[PDB]
Design a binder for this molecule. Structure first.
Ligand SMILES: [Zn+2]
Ligand SMILES: [Zn+2]
Ligand SMILES: [Zn+2]
Lengths: 146, 150, 43, 67, 166, 125, 42, 225, 763
């Protein structure tokens, strides 16, 4: 994660000064969000695979996902390893204030802690900005079932 | 006034959004038992945990268990509360397992169960949705005077 | 052309002065500008 | 509202150990967990009967007709 | 730690002087201050606090003659209308020998252009075929008390000091 | 950073208020409207600085002082309260003059002078 | 806003869906459900 | 691709949202030739081709003076000269040109004269001029040269017209398609609209799981046919 | 002995002197102590048109006390009013000045109706009852109060939330409907609502009292701004991108040949509706339409139309910025854009209109004796007061009981204003308080007001919401919140000029968009040169308590504005001030807070803590824990678990669960049954589910210590073996013990009331 936090911080400092080349469908802000969202989505895969390959036999949620009972291998990962990016409407967490998402982060911050990447597991227990960012994506899918 | 006891079909819940109904009532020599002889009041399925990801219910049981063995009420307040690594200190202090999993015997066949059973006190609350106030049935009865349907 | 006259600062709408030379002259103000040759840019 | 007579999970009689539980805490005071063990409540199903018992009969009896 | 002190002094209150703000004329032309609109036929309306300055503009430079004389009755002078609203804590300051002298500015006028001759061409062009509401009814029903013009009054420069001296 | 930018611009307005006050000396009939607070301290009795701080006109003269500090700054004190000062209105574009009104029968609009700029004084809260 | 004759026929509480396509029936009951593995799937 | 994608096929929606149009090219390897045919279907407004739009007010002549370049014309390789732009201005007729008055100054400039208030209509013609379409099809909003997963170049035109795109040179008109089922009906008949209803529903549901049997879709295609 | 983990003791210090039902209790205390006077003074005098000398004026008003009595009146206690199906109320003693015969007479203590008073407010007899007087009056001391007893049924007025009233909000979509609301509301002097729309790239001005909409250049000329260069300097500035967008609107003023304010006012004078009474001219009407008709909170009183012209110019600058960049729009769902209308505000709307209709129906019967014979036989004019005084009582009681809100004068027809208080749990009675209703429950959208916003951190509970048809439209307020009290703003305006703004009538309109302009409640006031020195000296006057708290100032930057809000209905939240990288509340203050002295609101007066608005949290940077305080911080959380409300504090370890799970508990903690009250055996209610042996949770929470949940708990500690057993527990069924049920595990009890009234008849 600290590699992913260091690579995402060597990518915004190339963005505050205008330097980032873009994919041919996006501008410089949107091509940041693909390089910074596609890099947080690969450390659920890195840290998730370190999890599931490590839990022993006669692990209970590993049996209930090998069966096809209640459980996915992602649900087990979020309870043990990183819960991961809280995607809201396809994007990250929107700026709920003037130029940041939440007053506990500095203004003009695109750091992954600030835009919705929760790192504590459910066993670890979610931090107070991690708690709210996960709670927004919960209701966004709780009203998408009504 | 009316007194009423749990029937098949009353709703109980824990404090973790896991609503549930009473499916069977079991004779207490058929329940599993530990070395001290404690039998459960509720048996809860392990299949309501992985899809729902209520890990804070797995900590309510240990903090509930270590607290009642210590004699103190514990705390599960948000962003804090009692810690799992020293609720598991009280729990080895007695001679229970640190993880809250006990070796229960089987009440039906007498044998050791082949898994350790996660076992302790959860706070259950009983809901107002009771099957006595919900079971109804009609053969023939009054009809609406306009449509002459039931 | 978005150019405002002196002394009342209304909009200098240009007009065909008595079927002759174009002049830009304010309305409700007797200011005028006879022989302009003026232009603008808009990229 | 008043103490259960028996533990729910064993049937061990715990209703006679509420009047004596409060005396071990009020006088000769103990730390609520050796006052349980002194009354002889080993099993945790039986300790939770009187530890988490909230006694509401004392508050309900304040509102009767004075009679 | 200071160096010098300027004797901030105040003047009296028997003047009720006003200040003017010409919303059209800029202050600068070529980094020098622009020249004052020279001659005026000023008039004032008490109980409504209206200032009307009549600044005549020059002919023969950018001034047409057929336009003004045909329908606007041949006007050559511009009326500037503004309202004097009070604003407290305002003070004029001339400085003599490193001493400022505060004089209480009583009202501030926001002088904007005005067109009397459209009102002339409003009444005289319909008669062929033919709360704050009160604050305008008091305005138009009162005769605008004319004030003669005076430029370069140096007696006020001494009038503050003779009542500062006590 | 923004409080440092307003600090140096006030430091820029403190030399710019000293030139435009010293150059304006003894040029006759040329004024400067400048803004004081509405309520002033009392002068029959001196209201002390912290008492005027709390609740937030006919006068004689020599009621204050415009002190020039050695470092770069200026500060008006009146009576005993200490205020701060800055050329803080705007670079005005509309042209300004001062006209004296006369009441009833000597009816005249005396044109006194022309406004240089506008400086403001605030209590040092 | 009284009901006319057209107001008795409109809406999902009127006649066409509310008395003709859907209607309360007899010899029916409604009860909370509950599991039983011992009885057959039919 | 949601359930409102189904809901706009299920009823015959004349105006759908996002009506993208595939197109197959005869030059699937030359990148420059892909850019040639891309500009031929893409509409080009006058703003992207000009330097400036001005007007000069000499003593009796008043004219809109438009200067364009040729350094844009070779970068985005349009087959556009300075003359048919002046044709395309007169072609527009949303601005009442009385089109015999257009003059062309040498190689870089077009003078739109006007003569009879004269200022009101010349002000309105000042801003309604630099957004007219000078080359391309008017209902095509945008186009994207897309690389297929074998490397081939099949551009995603995103407008309304299919007859115009399938007749554009470079685009082979046998293999170009459209999301819009009513617009396939106007050019390709009913039987290529039946075959397109069942292919936009075997593609909308198949992006969400939903392994419906295809014979349940073919019968839905035929009720609409 | 004291450290970083001890600052949460401010949360029992906050809730001690405040409580959780203060948003009901303070509002009703404000109404019966301040707003009763500001209704009597708004219509004091009764003017008899027949013989214009028999006037009648009301001197003052008070409820529940006669002036000659040194003691408050005896009220029937609130529990007896539940049993006897009465209304728990208090008499409204007005005293009256009237004319009788040939002299004027004051009469004292006229009872005009009865006011249904709220429980635990000032006039309730439960106010300062020492829990032994609660038992004599058969009342539960753990009851929250905050509700009314009307015809026996106990009714709660829910917290309504509206959009922010007197401020500007920018909407936009494709097809270019860039509209700008401003719902002006001076109480009902006028209740009006303007728009600003761009049609065809041309800015207009729609208003519902105009026949057809007016363009924008010939309405600034209707105000004083007529120079037509400054209109290009009030809405464009020196920005060349905006000068192109507005330039179409200039020539349209010349196209109608409008050039003076005389001619500009006469345009809109012939565009009005409701010409009724005066037969005044179109000049006298068009100058009245700018007076008190378009933007009604900005009433003009004289010739100077300057600040109102600057208002419409700063509306249309936000339109031109929205046309250029389409993302400069305002969120309608942002919590700073909301106002919470409480129970005193609603009853002041309700009691005023009944006192209008009292005085109208008393005037049209005070002349039914004057123009009739027996001229020499005078009458005291105080014998027909009780003819209509049973409409004050019956109209207050009906509108609370039915919940219907039929205000003829104010023109609002709201439904669902009240609800029956829930007596399912102890949690239901406290979850029905702190509950917030919304305006979206008439027309439907997707993914708008139902998604929670990040701007409700600490203001609203992030999990307590129903699931189903109201998910995100009903919401709940957190623990440490406060609703702002509306206060006077002209002392706050006069503080702004002293602190260094210079007035809008003093500033040039050319150089207005080069300096930050201050905005006292959305209205432009001045223009400061140095804003962050101005804002810092305004917090410093608030932290010293010179200017009040609940007065928020925040310096926007993209708008380049300094807003100052002081109106009521904003949601505050207390925070600890930090300074130069160091929390200002030291361990000496927590040592004093514990041992009795120096309570909460001594942390406000001594400058230690601070209420922050939602908007003022933009101009901040808040630490969560003391270990996270960097030098650029400016606040610190008192306690992070107050992100959750009262009901969501029942959950043990919520941060370990998944978030949809913590929302289902909030709906199901209100449905679980246990103990209700201490008079739960003395009450006769419609349906009352009780539990025989309720136990307090083994794992508890600080949040349920605070709300006293462990003294009336709802549940039992079951011994739970998490295992798969019998195949009768497959999908959420649970296996139960028979010998537990025989001993009283989960055994409940139902109670039901049955009322008959032996009515006597007219026969
Ligand atoms: Zn002019
Ligand atoms: Zn028992
Ligand atoms: Zn037991």
């Amino acid at each position: 994660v600290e590699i992913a936090y260091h690579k995402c911080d060597e990518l915004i400092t190339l963005f505050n000064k205008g330097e980032l080349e873009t994919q041919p469908g996006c501008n410089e802000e949107q091509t940041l969000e693909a390089k910074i969202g596609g890099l947080l989505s690969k450390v659920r895969e890195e840290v998730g695979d370190v999890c599931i390959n490590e839990l022993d036999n006669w692990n209970a949620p590993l049996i209930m996902a090998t069966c096809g009972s209640k459980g996915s291998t992602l649900n087990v990962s979020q309870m043990v390893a990183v819960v991961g990016q809280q995607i809201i409407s396809g994007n990250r967490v929107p700026d709920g204030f003037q130029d940041r998402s939440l007053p506990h982060f500095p203004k003009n911050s695109k750091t992954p802690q600030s835009k919705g990447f929760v790192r504590n597991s459910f066993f670890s227990g979610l931090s107070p900005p991690e708690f709210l960012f996960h709670a927004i994506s919960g209701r966004e899918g709780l009203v998408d079932t009504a | 006034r009316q007194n009423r006891r749990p029937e098949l079909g009353d709703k109980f819940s824990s404090r973790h959004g896991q609503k549930g109904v009473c499916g069977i009532i079991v004779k207490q020599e058929d329940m599993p038992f530990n070395d001290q002889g404690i039998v459960p009041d509720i048996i809860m399925n392990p299949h309501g945990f992985p899809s729902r990801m209520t890990v804070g219910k797995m900590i309510e049981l240990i903090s509930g268990k270590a607290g009642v063995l210590n004699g103190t009420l514990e705390y599960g307040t948000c962003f804090g509360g009692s810690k799992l690594e020293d609720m598991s200190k009280i729990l080895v202090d007695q001679g229970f397992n640190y993880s809250g999993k006990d070796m229960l015997y089987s009440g039906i066949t007498g044998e050791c169960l082949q898994a350790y059973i996660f076992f302790g006190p959860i706070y259950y609350q009983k809901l107002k949705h009771m099957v006595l106030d919900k079971m109804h049935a009609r053969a023939r009865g009054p009809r609406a005077v306009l449509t002459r349907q039931p | 052309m978005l150019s405002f006259c002196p002394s009342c600062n209304n909009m200098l709408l240009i007009t065909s002065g008595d079927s002759g030379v174009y002049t830009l002259a304010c309305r409700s103000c007797p200011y005028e500008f006879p022989i302009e040759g003026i232009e603008i840019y808009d990229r | 509202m008043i103490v259960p007579v028996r533990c729910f999970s064993c049937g061990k009689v715990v209703g006679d150990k509420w009047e004596s539980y409060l005396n071990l805490l009020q006088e000769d005071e103990l730390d609520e967990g050796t006052a349980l063990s002194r009354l002889g409540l080993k099993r945790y199903c039986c300790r939770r009967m009187i530890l988490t018992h909230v006694d509401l009969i004392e508050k309900f009896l304040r509102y009767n007709p004075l009679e | 730690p200071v160096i010098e002190e300027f004797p901030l002094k105040i003047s009296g209150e028997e003047e009720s002087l006003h200040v003017f703000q010409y919303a059209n004329r800029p202050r600068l032309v070529g980094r020098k201050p622009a020249e004052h609109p020279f001659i005026s036929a000023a008039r004032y309306k008490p109980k409504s606090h209206l200032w009307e300055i009549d600044i005549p503009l020059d002919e023969q430079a950018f001034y047409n003659k057929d336009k003004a004389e045909s329908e606007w009755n041949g006007v050559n002078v511009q009326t500037l209308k503004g309202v004097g609203v009070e604003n407290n804590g305002q003070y004029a300051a001339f400085v003599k020998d490193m001493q400022v002298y505060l004089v209480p500015i009583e009202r501030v006028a926001q002088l904007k252009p005005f067109f009397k001759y459209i009102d002339d061409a409003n009444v005289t062009r319909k008669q062929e075929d033919a709360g704050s509401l009160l604050a305008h009814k008091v305005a138009d029903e009162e005769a605008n008390i004319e004030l003669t013009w005076a430029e370069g009054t140096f007696e006020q420069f001494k009038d503050t000091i003779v009542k500062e001296a006590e | 950073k923004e409080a440092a930018a307003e600090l140096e611009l006030l430091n820029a307005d403190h030399q710019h208020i000293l030139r435009k006050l010293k150059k304006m000396n003894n040029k006759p009939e040329r004024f400067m409207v400048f803004q004081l607070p509405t309520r002033l301290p009392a002068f029959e009795r001196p209201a002390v600085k912290e008492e005027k701080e709390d609740m937030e006109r006919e006068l004689a003269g020599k009621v204050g002082s415009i002190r020039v500090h050695k470092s770069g700054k200026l500060s008006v004190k009146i009576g005993n309260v200490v205020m701060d000062i800055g050329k803080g209105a705007e670079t005005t574009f509309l042209q300004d003059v001062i006209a004296l009104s006369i009441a009833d029968d000597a009816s005249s609009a005396e044109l006194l002078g022309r406004v240089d700029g506008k400086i403001v004084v605030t209590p040092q809260i | 806003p009284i009901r006319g004759f057209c107001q008795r026929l409109k809406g999902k509480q009127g006649r066409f869906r509310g008395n003709l396509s859907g209607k309360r029936v007899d010899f029916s009951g409604r009860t909370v459900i509950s599991p039983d593995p011992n009885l057959s799937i039919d | 691709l949601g359930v409102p994608r189904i809901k706009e096929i299920i009823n015959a929606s004349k105006v759908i949202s996002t009506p993208i149009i595939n197109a197959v090219l005869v030059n699937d390897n030359d990148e420059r030739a892909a850019r040639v045919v891309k500009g031929r279907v893409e509409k080009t407004l006058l703003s992207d081709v000009a330097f400036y739009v001005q007007d000069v007010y000499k003593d009796n002549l008043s004219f809109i003076q438009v200067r364009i370049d040729l350094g844009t014309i070779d970068k985005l390789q349009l087959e556009l000269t300075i003359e048919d732009i002046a044709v395309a201005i007169t072609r527009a007729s949303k601005l009442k040109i009385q089109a015999s008055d257009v003059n062309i100054i040498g190689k870089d400039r077009i003078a739109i004269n006007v003569f009879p208030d004269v200022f009101y209509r010349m002000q309105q013609l000042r801003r309604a001029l630099p957004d007219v379409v000078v080359k391309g099809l008017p209902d095509i909003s945008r186009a994207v040269i897309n690389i297929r997963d074998d490397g081939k170049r099949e551009l995603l035109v995103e407008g309304y017209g299919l007859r115009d795109v399938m007749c554009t040179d470079g685009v082979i008109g046998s293999r170009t398609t459209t999301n819009h089922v009513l617009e396939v009906f106007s050019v390709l008949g009913i039987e290529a609209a039946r075959y397109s209803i069942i292919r936009e529903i075997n593609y909308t549901m198949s992006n969400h799981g939903m392994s419906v049997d295809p014979r349940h879709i073919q019968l839905l295609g035929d009720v609409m046919t | 002995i004291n450290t970083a983990q001890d600052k949460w003791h401010l949360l029992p210090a906050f809730l001690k002197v405040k409580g959780l039902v203060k948003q009901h209790l303070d509002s009703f205390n404000y109404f019966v102590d301040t707003d009763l006077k500001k209704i009597i003074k708004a219509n004091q005098l009764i003017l008899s048109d027949v013989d214009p000398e028999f006037y009648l004026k009301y001197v003052d008003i008070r409820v529940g006390k006669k002036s000659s009595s040194s003691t408050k009146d005896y009220l029937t206690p609130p529990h007896e009013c539940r049993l006897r199906d009465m209304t728990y109320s208090a008499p409204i003693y007005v005293d009256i000045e009237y004319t009788r015969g040939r002299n004027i007479i004051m009469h004292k203590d006229v009872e005009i109706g009865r006011m249904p008073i709220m429980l635990r407010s000032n006039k309730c007899i439960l106010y300062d009852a020492d829990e032994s007087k609660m038992a004599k009056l058969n009342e539960c001391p753990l009851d929250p109060g905050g509700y009314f007893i009307v015809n026996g049924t106990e009714k709660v007025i829910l917290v309504q939330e509206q959009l922010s009233k007197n401020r500007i909000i920018v909407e936009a979509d494709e097809k270019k409907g860039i509209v700008q609301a401003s719902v002006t509301s001076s109480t009902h002097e006028r209740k009006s609502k303007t728009y600003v729309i761009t049609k065809n790239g041309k800015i207009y001005l729609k208003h519902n009292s105009i026949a057809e909409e007016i363009p924008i250049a010939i309405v600034l000329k209707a105000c004083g701004i007529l120079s037509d260069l400054e209109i290009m300097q009030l809405v464009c500035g020196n920005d060349s991108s905006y000068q192109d967008i507005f330039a179409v609107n200039l020539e349209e003023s010349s196209k109608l040949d409008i050039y003076t304010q005389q001619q500009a006012l006469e345009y809109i004078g012939a565009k009005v509706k409701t010409m009724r009474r005066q037969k005044l001219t179109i000049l006298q009407e068009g100058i009245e339409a700018i007076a008190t008709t378009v933007i009604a909170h900005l009433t003009v009183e004289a010739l100077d139309f300057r600040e109102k012209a600057l208002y419409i110019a700063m509306m249309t600058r936000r339109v031109v910025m929205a046309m250029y960049n389409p993302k400069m729009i305002d969120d309608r769902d942002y919590v700073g854009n909301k106002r919470l209308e409480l129970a005193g505000q609603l009853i002041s709307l309700l009691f005023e209109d009944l006192f209008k209709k009292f005085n109208n129906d008393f005037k049209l019967s005070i002349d039914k004796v004057l123009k009739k014979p027996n001229r020499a036989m005078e009458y005291d004019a105080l014998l027909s007061i009780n003819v209509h005084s049973n409409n004050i009582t019956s109209g207050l009681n009906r509108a609370i009981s039915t919940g219907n809100w039929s205000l003829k004068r104010f023109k609002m027809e709201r439904a669902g204003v009240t609800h029956v208080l829930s007596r399912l749990s102890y949690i239901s009675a406290l979850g029905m308080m702190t509950r917030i209703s919304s305006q979206f429950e008439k027309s439907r959208k997707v993914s708008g007001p139902r998604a929670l916003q990040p701007s409700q951190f600490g203001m609203l509970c992030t999990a307590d919401t129903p699931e189903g048809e109201a998910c995100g439209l009903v919401k709940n307020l957190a623990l440490m919140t406060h609703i702002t009290t509306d206060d006077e703003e002209e002392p706050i305006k006069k503080l702004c000029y002293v602190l260094g703004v210079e007035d809008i009538t003093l500033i040039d309109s050319a150089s207005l968009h080069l300096n930050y302009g201050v905005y006292l409640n959305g209205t432009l006031i001045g223009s400061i040169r140095f804003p962050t020195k101005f804002v810092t000296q305004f917090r410093h006057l608030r932290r010293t308590g010179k200017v009040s708290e609940f007065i928020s100032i925040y310096s926007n930057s993209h708008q380049m504005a300094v807003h100052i809000a002081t109106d009521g209905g904003r949601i505050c939240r207390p925070l600890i001030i930090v300074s130069d990288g160091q929390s200002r509340v030291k361990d000496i203050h927590l040592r004093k807070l514990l041992d009795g002295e120096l309570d909460f609101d001594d942390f406000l007066k001594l400058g230690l803590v601070e209420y922050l608005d939602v908007n003022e949290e933009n101009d901040s940077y808040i630490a969560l824990y003391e270990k996270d305080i960097v030098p650029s911080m400016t606040h610190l959380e008192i306690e992070p678990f107050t992100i959750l409300g009262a009901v969501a504090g029942l959950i043990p370890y919520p941060h370990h669960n998944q978030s949809p799970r913590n929302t289902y508990q909030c709906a199901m903690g209100k449905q679980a049954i246990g103990a209700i009250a201490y008079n739960q055996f003395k009450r006769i209610d419609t349906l009352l589910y009780l539990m025989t042996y309720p136990q307090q949770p083994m794992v508890k929470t600080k949040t349920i210590e605070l709300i006293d949940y462990d003294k009336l708990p709802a549940g039992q500690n079951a011994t739970v073996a998490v295992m798969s057993y019998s195949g009768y527990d497959i999908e959420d069924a649970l296996v139960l013990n028979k010998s537990s049920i025989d001993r009283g595990f989960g055994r409940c009890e139902t109670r039901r009331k049955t009322t008959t009234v032996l009515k006597r008849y007219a026969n």
